[PDB]
């Protein structure tokens, strides 16, 4: 039997058109969104989108991109009670297997930021770690929170890491850790990765830094590290670091991925509760990460395009957005896009 | 009023004006760094006299234990001042503090008056959980390919750090303090640490609690270290370990101008977290501002606070005013020698 | 004496002569069972009178609670008899009647029964059980896809005052012995634990004597010969207790329809059978009494009527066993609940 | 036949060493082709495990394990974990010349060596509270479903029953319950699967015995239905039992009782240590010797006086032995 009229993996097509999963979700999402979906049907671009609203209808959002297997996404809001839900923007991720996350810190020409010119890429595993969910209280006032780490899952980050780094011309991937004291948990993490970027992917400089320490170089002299692989929790914190030194959550891409599926988020995971319905918010995360997901989905032609336009629409000067130091509205800085996109 | 939480029990000496106090002269640059202390100290008229020790570790039964003389010296004084000390079967540092009962690190890192660094305006205040947390010795393996390390949160720990924390913000004059946390995802563990806060919140009326998300707390630091200009920030053994180390390379790029405190229910010491600097010891260019600092930190635990001040405000800080002074780490020429002496002059 | 730990605060009714005792009549062979202890119970002159409840459980947060009528009813006079309740339509009802009346120590002693042959002879045998952690807290993880863990939690805290209940008891039954089932072979710290918080209260208490067992020795002797353990009082963590308690009582009589257990809290204390519910004979008048009315007696020395007890023990039920006129169809006998009921008082 | 074979022996702690020498005598005595490289021990329970790995096949009493704090840990389990020898089986046969409470009585009981509450993964939080981890996964846990199964098939057994506390203990011991009965329907379909709750299991066992044919259980349950098993049949001096793993194979007394007590008394019993030596030899498919060696041993005891003490004889382990010796000389 099988093979060509099989493919029921790849991405929901049809004539020509494309079915991506969208995802608003809370805050800025369903702002920042919009701006993707207009500046996509005014470059006419061929995807349709299914779009999904939501407590535990986070299964609805997972049936949809099982289907179409491709999405687009805002973060989703978390509570902090004790009566709370839980994550769901991770339960996403856990229930399908999206176990890479890559945030893409990349300054941008038209924005004054403490250190310039700064390029560094942070990939972290996203169903292990201390995002792992498992805690219980023994006797009352004593919490343990258990942080699994196993071989199978650290391997696969390891590879995913080295393989996106052989890919995208990047010459060094570092581990972060705490691996002096976590000698087990963080250990393995540490060891796996440099292990394997021995005996594979030899071409690439492997080496670990611990999480602390990592901390302050970067924040100190960022321009030393080119990719830095991590467990959960190092990688929101280093992540945050990188989102400001940048610029702030606005600038910065990110995308999930799996084996069969792939979910685009901004980079940064912010949900901008505050400003929701302002129309304040900056939209370049998304759009940014938007173009991720074309060129991942093959047009590119388009994602070359519209970042261009996006990128050059900062750089130069008043028109921008808020936070950014402009004075424009999201509303705004979408039009000047998708008008230097008419004119390319 | 210094922190109920830590407080020393002063008595000075009776035969003698003075305090009593170990020191640890500690190894490497530690020496040099340290009688540049005691001159310093000496010329400001301070109460005190020093009792030095070593702490080069013992092995009772395999487990690293620490000396009976430094022991027996650093209960009676209730107060100690550590330099760097090498990497000599049990953390050095950690059975310092199991044995002394220490628990909150207090992590200052403000910017210097004559040393551009890409921050500015950061002054910040950070106490940290040294007691358990994420650094509980507890892992395990659980099969062949799986490995459990387990964070341990606990009312008893929490409340005094945060307590500790509230008291010393109060202490300093800063209006608000937030609890960085993760409750998120860490909902049993760092939702306990949160709500103990909360529940001594209360207890605390004249500061406000406000609660942040690592999250935040590292992205909103770097973006504009001057938010928490007012801040104390109190948190479990991670976040705390990196939000420090974070907080000294925004001050000053590097950790050779921070001090810590790592206080105990009666005992408390006071060191440098700068390491041993081998290679520049003994040729008189290591740079005692840290560990000086750390005295002025010590100090104020202890109530002098006049001279604390003197030594501060005036002195050392001042003196890193002028590249004629400074040492080789700040662009500056002088010696640790002509530092000291720079220093004792603004003293 | 009475043990200190579970120390009953008497304080009779002072309207009436008598004492307070919630029942739980509970169901299936429960109610004739039940009617059958309040006469015998009746015509021996007990100060008590019974203040039967419903445990019938509530739902409040979808964690099973149960009905106030029955907690207050239970926390105001500190003792309740109840016998055997179903598997309730729909986060165990034993359970959550543990946690809330804090109950911590089960009680099982299994003896032979005169008149009544099995297989193993000359069994007198008692048992504390911790039923508060150990094996049986709720705890347990999936720390990944085909891996599980389950917690067995040990506190000294949980230990101390059950291992104090044992040797309290077991001088209160006049046993020199007190052995501390265990396994610290394996599992160095929490069966550790457990054993030296025995070893550190042995000192305070001098007139009884500390031996410490592996369960390993523990099920082979006791089998071997269940006598030599008739000067005993063994106490254990919840999981060798569950099982040892079992299978003292498939010793003691090849079945558990003649086993009575106590459940002893700090202030509270519930004696019950342990035998089930027997739906399928419920009605037809053919239970056992046996079970719950030697729990009965359990209870009155627990309350202090030393006399009474030995009375409805030592006379009657235990007496009455003899002669299969009397006893009832689990024991070969021909005697109906009713007739056992009448057939006791009589020797009462 | 023809060729020689190399066996490990570890004689170990208590009777240990006599009950070995035993089946030495009796081996030599029926000159079996067999040449123990024999080891002795703290940590060189390495040596124990390098010589299996070579020799592949070993014949070994128990060791000593310390219940205060700073004790070394079994080190019988060590071995086992070591070479993952996962699978315990033990005998539990009633023989003809003793005197038990429940006669005619035939059950085996199988226990996963590795794992459970054997995991051995314990820690303090705070002073005076204690966890101790019990581990139970999916892959170790088939794998002993289908040895067990497997074996009563091997042996014509027809029932096979896991033993559990899954009421309570609902994913660690619920997970071992589903998969045994789980893979005893969709595979070994001729065989009855059942589960019983390791309380009342206990009882039946003690009371009722007769209902049991296989019993399967985690390493816990199998220590305690495992001595529940040897009181019923006379002691453990009468126990054969062995350990499997996919390469190697162990075998020692079923019962697991070091006799520290009677050390160096000549008093114990080898009945145990013979009769799983006699397991031994089936295994490596000597078997014509097993078979014989094991009527040996069995007639003895049946055969009144002459037999060891504890099973109401008045006989030294040494006279025992000369007297199976004696038995296996006139055959």
């Given at each position: 039997?099988?093979?060509?009229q ?23 999402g ?13 470059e ?23 289907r ?7 973060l989703?809001?978390?509570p ?10 991770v ?29 560094l ?9 201390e995002?792992?969910?498992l ?19 650290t391997?696969?980050?390891?590879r ?105 988020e ?9 400003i ?28 070359t ?8 629409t900062?750089?130069e ?28 | ?69 430094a ?17 000599p ?26 040393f ?16 358990e ?71 605390y ?22 938010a928490?200009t ?22 000053a ?25 081998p ?13 000086l ?26 003196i890193?005013?002028?590249?004629e ?23």
């Amino acid at each position: 039997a099988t093979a060509a009229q099989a493919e029921r993996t790849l991405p929901k097509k049809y004539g020509g058109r494309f079915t991506v999963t969208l995802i608003p979700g809370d805050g800025v999402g369903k702002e920042i969104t919009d701006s993707v979906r207009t500046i996509f049907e005014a470059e006419n671009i061929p995807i349709d989108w299914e779009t999904i609203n939501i407590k535990e209808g986070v299964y609805e959002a997972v049936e949809s991109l099982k289907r179409n297997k491709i999405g687009l996404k805002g973060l989703w809001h978390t509570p902090a009670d004790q009566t709370g839900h839980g994550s769901l923007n991770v339960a996403l991720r856990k229930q399908l297997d999206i176990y890479a996350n890559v945030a893409l810190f990349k300054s941008l020409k038209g924005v004054k930021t403490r250190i310039p010119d700064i390029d560094l890429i942070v990939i972290r595993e996203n169903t292990e770690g201390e995002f792992s969910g498992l805690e219980h209280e023994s006797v009352p006032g004593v919490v343990e929170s258990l942080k699994v780490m196993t071989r199978p899952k650290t391997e696969r980050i390891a590879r995913f890491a080295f393989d996106f780094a052989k890919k995208y011309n990047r010459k060094s991937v570092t581990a972060v850790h705490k691996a002096n004291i976590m000698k087990l948990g963080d250990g393995l993490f540490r060891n796996i990765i440099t292990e394997i970027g021995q005996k594979e992917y030899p071409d690439i400089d492997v080496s670990s830094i611990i999480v602390d320490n990592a901390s302050m170089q970067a924040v100190a002299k960022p321009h030393q590290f080119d990719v830095l692989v991590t467990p959960s929790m190092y990688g929101t914190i280093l992540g945050n670091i990188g989102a400001a030194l940048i610029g702030g959550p606005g600038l910065v891409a990110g995308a999930n991925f799996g084996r069969d599926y792939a979910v685009f988020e901004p980079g940064s995971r912010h949900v901008g509760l505050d400003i929701k319905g302002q129309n304040v918010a900056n939209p370049t995360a998304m759009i940014l990460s938007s173009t991720l997901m074309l060129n991942h989905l093959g047009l590119n032609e388009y994602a070359t395009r519209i970042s261009k336009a996006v990128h050059e629409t900062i750089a130069e000067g008043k028109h921008t957005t808020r936070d950014i130091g402009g004075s424009s509205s999201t509303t705004d800085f979408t039009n000047e896009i998708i008008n230097k996109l008419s004119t390319m | 009023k210094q922190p109920s939480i830590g407080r020393y029990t002063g008595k000075p000496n009776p035969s003698t004006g003075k305090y009593t106090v170990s020191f640890i002269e500690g190894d490497g640059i530690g020496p040099e760094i340290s009688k540049s202390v005691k001159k310093i100290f000496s010329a400001a008229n301070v109460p005190i006299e020093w009792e030095s020790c070593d702490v080069s570790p013992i092995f009772v039964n395999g487990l690293t234990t620490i000396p009976d003389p430094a022991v027996q010296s650093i209960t009676k004084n209730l107060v100690a001042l550590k330099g760097p000390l090498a990497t000599p079967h049990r953390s050095l540092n950690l059975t310092l503090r199991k044995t002394f009962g220490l628990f909150a690190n207090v992590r200052p890192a403000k910017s210097i008056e004559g040393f551009k660094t890409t921050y500015e305006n950061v002054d910040l205040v950070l106490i940290r959980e040294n007691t358990e947390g994420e650094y509980s010795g507890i892992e395990h393996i659980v099969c062949p390919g799986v490995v459990q390390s387990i964070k341990l949160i606990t009312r008893d720990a929490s409340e005094r750090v945060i307590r500790y924390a509230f008291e010393y913000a109060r202490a300093i004059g800063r209006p608000r303090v937030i609890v960085v946390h993760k409750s998120t995802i860490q909902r049993l563990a760092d939702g306990l640490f949160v709500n103990v806060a909360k529940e001594l919140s209360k207890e605390y009326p004249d500061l406000t609690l406000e609660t942040e998300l690592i999250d935040n707390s590292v992205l909103k630091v770097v973006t504009n270290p001057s938010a928490y200009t007012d801040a104390v920030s109190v948190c479990p053994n991670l976040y705390g370990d990196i939000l420090s180390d974070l907080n000294s390379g925004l001050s000053a790029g590097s950790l050779g101008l921070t001090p810590s405190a790592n206080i105990g229910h009666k005992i408390s010491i006071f060191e440098a977290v700068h390491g041993s600097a081998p290679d520049i010891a003994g040729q008189d260019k290591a740079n005692p501002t840290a560990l000086l600092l750390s005295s002025v930190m010590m100090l104020n635990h202890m109530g002098l606070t006049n001279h604390a001040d003197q030594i501060q405000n005036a002195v050392l800080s001042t003196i890193a005013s002028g590249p004629e002074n400074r040492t080789g780490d700040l662009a500056g020429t002088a010696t640790t020698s002509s530092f000291t002496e720079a220093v004792i002059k603004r003293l």
